[PDB]
Amino acid sequence: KVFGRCELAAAMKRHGLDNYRGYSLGNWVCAAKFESNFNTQATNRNTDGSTDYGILQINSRWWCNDGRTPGSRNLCNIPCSALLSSDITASVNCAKKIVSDGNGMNAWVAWRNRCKGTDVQAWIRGCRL
């Protein structure tokens, strides 16, 4: 599923991501934009041989199992394929664990490089939330 911007904002809010660990909804929508372009089916191979999965490009090195990331963890206790579903529940539940890990949203390099410090509220502009 390719979410609309406000459609994804509404879904993230419903699942309690808005101001989760003190990150406003616009931060999460901004991260999703630059990680996945709002595409639940987005997959990207990392140089270390791990893969990033779904709207928030959750890495198989730590968070989900894909069966092909040697020496990796599955700290969200999910198959990485569950992160590609049209229903973002699994991605959000796993993102809540990632952002609680100590470095907040800096875990998402694209958030640090493209969203951090910017006018992230622009990403929920005009949304009925």
Identify the residue among 69, 76, 107, 110 touching Na ion (CB under 5 A). 69
Instruction: Look at residues 29, 32, 5 and name the one whose alpha carbon lies nearest to residue 19.
Output: 29
Question: Is 7 considered catalytic here?
Answer: no
Question: Site for Na ion (CB under 5 A): which residue of 72, 90, 99, 123?
Answer: 72
The closest of 29, 33, 110 to 42, measured between CA atoms, is: 33
Question: In this structure, what DSSP letter does residue 51 have?
Answer: E
CB of residue 9 to Na ion, shortest distance in Å: 29
What is the binding site for Na ion (CB under 5 A)? 60, 65, 69, 72, 74
Binding-site residue positions for substrate: 101
| Catalytic (active-site) positions | 35, 52
